[PDB]
């Protein structure tokens, strides 16, 4: 008999597991993640089953999948300070399933990690043992009503030439939009990569504060301003939902934004070296949609992702 | 625009709705019914939906499925006492999901009858209207961990025939066990019919109360036990589970209750006609599979009826 994790969806392209957490109440939630006894038989031994963080799963993971020439692609072993769980879980003989429940607190996290929680079952409980052990790389994505990828197929940036706006914009497909708290999310500005060295990209950072009203506070993260932020006008927001035409259980939820604002790439010569600012206009609107099955009606099992 | 209600899964054969409910503390639980405002176009009023309960439309399903000379197969009204939910559900402009938290309490509720809570959509909050109203027939299952629909291959009835049990035995493929409370079930005695008239049928109601120590008591409900119900040894049960080969997410639990009775039927002359009891011996198991989803945490989402 074997004694293993299984999470909600099956592991990615490297073996990382990416999980949905709820951003609440500041910012406390829980996870349950199952632990599963299987075989052809029925389980006839009580299990004290023993799960321990992984630091070193994770590093492998990292060289094996990005190299060590590429650490700004390498996921990160999540704090000790963001998480808590029991290291004992108890399956009963004549049972199979019991739940790990994770314990996160996600007030002031940074998503500008990709943060990972390894977990190794280093004990399955059963007599003797000591082979293979069984793991779970958890890819933790927390996430509020107005998070996520949204489409920027409509988000035009214009390159400054001569102290005023370019004629020709550059666009692209999509635009990824991380939590801070339950109602406030940042992107990186413009077109700057989100996959870029982590010292530059943190310091083109726009946190994004949804209203009562339908109005957006848009400010840079970096206090010292040195991307040269600066919103033009008001930004806008508007939610809408309807049910799709072929699926008529389908609810697809619409969070648009609008906005206009200027800033400056200073990092595109790479680390430590000092460029001519390049000073981008930035137009239009994103909208992320989140697709909602309609029949399931707890807040978070309902959403497809 | 439609508006209408979104129970988790199709109607059935006949226009009824089966909704599952679990048995909690004392009784009280909430289920949440979706109301969907359905269209090519986004929802661009505030409505306020009226809801109703609808004695007719129950009453002719009743008619047209089985007939006014088949009563003991027709669906009964909820008792007014057992549930409540709010007369208006309001769906702001932009949105097009809400729910209808209809809140049950089911304590001491007899389930001999096949309750129904029949509703009605008697206004979809969009100007004038006054044609053909959005229904649901909701018919509620109570259950808990031993309730529903159990395998009885393994269940032998023998007939007294000159004072002492017959060597044949009768057998039937299955028998209801129905929720009393949140850890006892009845079924009815021996083969008697389900779907007998219901004033008789009661009287074969045997309560199944399952304790800590993995033994039932076993006990007629009728208090002056007319069908001479007669425990013999001490009844058994035993609860399992493991997952399955085929869907290795899926576990399977198996609830075996054994024992052993007699019992007398003294009604299958008809209704108001003294007939000679004939004395039966049950002996044998009957065993209750309930199939879940390990990947889903929440106890009552992830069952699979």
Chains 1, 2 share one sequence.
Request: hydrophobic letters at 30%; glycine letters at 6%; proline letters at 4%.
């Amino acid at each position: 008999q074997y004694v293993s994790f299984k999470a909600p969806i099956a592991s990615g392209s490297d073996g990382v597991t990416t999980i949905y957490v709820r951003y609440k109440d500041n910012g406390k939630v829980t996870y349950q993640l199952p632990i599963i006894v299987s075989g052809s038989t029925v389980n006839s031994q009580d299990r004290d089953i023993h799960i321990a963080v992984d630091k070193d799963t994770l590093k492998t993971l990292n060289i094996e999948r990005f190299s060590l020439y590429r650490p700004e692609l390498w996921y990160t072993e999540m704090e000790e300070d963001k998480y808590e769980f029991p290291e004992t879980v108890h399956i009963p003989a004549g049972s199979c399933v019991e739940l790990l429940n994770i314990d996160f607190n996600l007030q002031d996290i940074d998503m500008l990690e990709k943060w990972v929680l390894p977990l190794t079952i280093v004990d399955d409980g059963s007599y003797a043992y000591q082979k293979n052990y069984a793991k779970a790389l958890l890819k933790v994505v927390p996430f509020n009503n107005y998070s996520g990828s949204y489409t920027a197929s409509s988000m035009k940036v214009y390159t400054y030439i001569n102290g005023k706006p370019d004629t020709n914009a550059r666009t692209t497909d999509k635009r990824t939009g991380y939590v801070v708290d339950n109602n406030s999310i940042f992107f990186y500005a413009g077109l700057i990569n989100e996959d870029m060295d982590k010292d530059m990209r943190k310091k083109y950072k726009i946190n994004v504060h949804f209203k009562e009203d339908g109005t957006l506070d848009m400010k840079q993260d970096d206090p010292s301003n040195e991307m040269e932020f600066e919103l033009i006008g008001t930004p806008t927001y508007s939610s809408t939902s309807v049910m799709d035409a072929t699926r008529p259980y389908l609810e697809r939820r619409y969070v648009q934004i609008m906005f206009e604002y200027d800033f400056q790439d200073f990092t595109y010569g790479g680390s430590g070296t000092e460029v001519i600012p390049i000073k981008y206009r930035v137009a239009g609107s994103m909208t992320l949609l989140r697709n909602i099955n309609t029949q399931i009606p707890d807040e978070d099992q309902q959403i497809e992702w």
